Design a protein around this nucleic acid. Structure first.
Ligand SMILES: Nc1ccn([C@H]2C[C@H](O)[C@@H](COP(=O)(O)NP(=O)(O)OP(=O)(O)O)O2)c(=O)n1
Ligand SMILES: [Mg+2]
Ligand SMILES: [Mg+2]
Length: 424
DNA sequence: ATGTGACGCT
DNA sequence: AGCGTCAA
């Protein structure tokens, strides 16, 4: 069993927030530029970076003042602020544009604001019947790389050489061949990406493979504005020098313990271990997942879900801005509640659903965790004053200050999240 | 002083 | 229900 039953694609917009700002402001197009939030602390935090600016070393999570040292001509678009908070509505609305287009071709799993997985298995079957044994020509794959080819001068010439080798070895006599299915999947993803660019102006990259992990890895191989086919046969060479941390979900603690417990570096080294061995170190599910994954096999389905299942709104209060008075906490809980309410009302009108749970999270000064404490409470009315009052009720117990007006220990984050949606 | 969404574990 | 991880 080779895990070649499905055709899965991962479409990811290139430097998404930048492209959103570049569409709106033509003077930013074809320039080193980045998107920044809050200009007051070190010129603001960089949150997205055009490929021209990336060539100078500018990255996400950099302060704009430091980015300017690397790239003095860097152009910056600023995130909208509302009620004292960075507001991401323009990017969420642009996300909805691209997802609705992708949804025309197949069912999609929203994986982030700027990417979706798509199960193309059925669409490939139908497209194979319309083709009626007719070969696939290179003109149908004008931006596709075949990973690991060519084998046996300039960028575009080698892409074509690899594509030509792939298409000349293709056995179209068989409508069940997985390589043919992947190839037809890639013809559809070219049309998908052309529709996105035509109808939004936004460019994106894609990976095409047999499962989600390989599709996502494939997408990043030839960014920007290109797509990549990772076939089952290409996995052994691909994985033989692929660091473990590059595989989705292995970029943190679990991947680091794989490396340390097993004494290995690359994904292909995992194949020498039995399934039971991997389960002993990493548990039954992780072990089974690793045993199949290092062979290019994974079964996680593309879930039919185009909409987020939580709706969240948070604000950081770093260092000396931390909230230390009762009245401060109440004012910022109401600012957040008002943003959440307008987001929730729009969600109900657009998507015919209502959240029923409100989760209230806070961070306390001196805690290195994301959240210091989470408490849930009922969400009955999209009313910001009631939501903020309710949110305060369930956290006022955390004020350990003897004086009534002060708040201690001081709060470095407030986080409101509406969840548990039901039809409406 | 980086600044919200999906999921597994218990 | 409350927490931790990974990321996007
Ligand atoms: N930590 C992060 C990751 C992403 N984002 C936002 C900004 C991104 O433009 C957008 C999509 O994230 P992304 O796909 O990981 N990278 P981006 O689309 O900017 O560039 P590519 O590397 O995908 O071409 O989500 C963020 O604000 N904070
Ligand atoms: Mg992207
Ligand atoms: Mg992305």
């Amino acid at each position: 069993a080779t895990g070649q039953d499905r055709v899965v694609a991962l479409v990811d917009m290139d430097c998404f927030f930048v492209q959103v700002e570049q569409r709106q402001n033509p003077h930013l197009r074809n320039k080193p530029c980045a998107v920044v939030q809050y200009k007051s602390w070190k010129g603001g935090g960089i949150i997205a970076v055009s490929y021209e600016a990336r060539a100078f070393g500018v990255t996400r999570s950099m302060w704009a003042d430091d980015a300017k040292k690397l790239c003095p001509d860097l152009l910056l678009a600023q995130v909208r602020e509302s009620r004292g908070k960075a507001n991401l509505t323009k990017y969420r609305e642009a996300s909805v544009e691209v997802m609705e287009i992708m949804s025309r071709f197949a069912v999609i799993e929203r994986a982030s604001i700027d990417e979706a997985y798509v199960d193309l298995t059925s669409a490939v079957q139908e497209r194979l019947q319309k083709l009626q044994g007719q070969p696939i020509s290179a003109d149908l794959l004008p931006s596709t790389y075949i990973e690991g080819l060519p084998q046996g001068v300039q960028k575009e010439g080698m892409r074509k050489q690899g594509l030509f080798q792939w298409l000349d070895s293709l056995q179209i006599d068989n409508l069940t061949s997985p390589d043919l299915q992947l190839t037809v999947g890639a013809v559809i993803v070219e049309e998908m990406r052309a529709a996105i660019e035509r109808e939004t102006g936004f460019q994106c990259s894609a990976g095409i493979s047999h499962n989600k992990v390989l599709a996502k890895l494939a997408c990043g191989l030839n960014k920007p504005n290109r797509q990549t086919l990772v076939s089952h046969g290409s996995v052994p060479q691909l994985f033989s020098q692929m660091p473990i941390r590059k595989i989705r979900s292995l970029g943190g603690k679990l991947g680091a313990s794989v490396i340390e417990i097993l004494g290995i570096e690359y994904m292909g080294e995992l194949t020498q271990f039995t399934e039971s061995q991997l389960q002993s170190h990493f548990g039954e599910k992780n072990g089974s997942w690793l045993y199949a994954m290092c062979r290019g096999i994974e079964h996680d389905p593309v879930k039919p879900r185009q909409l987020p299942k939580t709706i969240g709104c948070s604000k950081n209060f770093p260092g000396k801005t931390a909230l230390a008075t009762r009245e401060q906490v109440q004012w910022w809980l109401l600012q957040l509640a008002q943003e959440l309410e307008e987001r929730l009302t729009k969600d109900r009108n657009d998507n015919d659903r209502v959240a029923t749970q409100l989760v209230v999270s806070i961070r306390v000064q001196g805690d290195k965790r994301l959240s210091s404490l989470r408490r849930c409470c009922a969400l009955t009315r999209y009313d910001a004053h009631k939501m903020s009052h309710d949110a305060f009720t369930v956290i006022k117990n955390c004020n350990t200050s003897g004086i009534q007006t002060e708040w201690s220990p001081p709060l470095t984050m407030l986080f409101l999240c509406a969840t548990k949606f039901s039809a409406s």
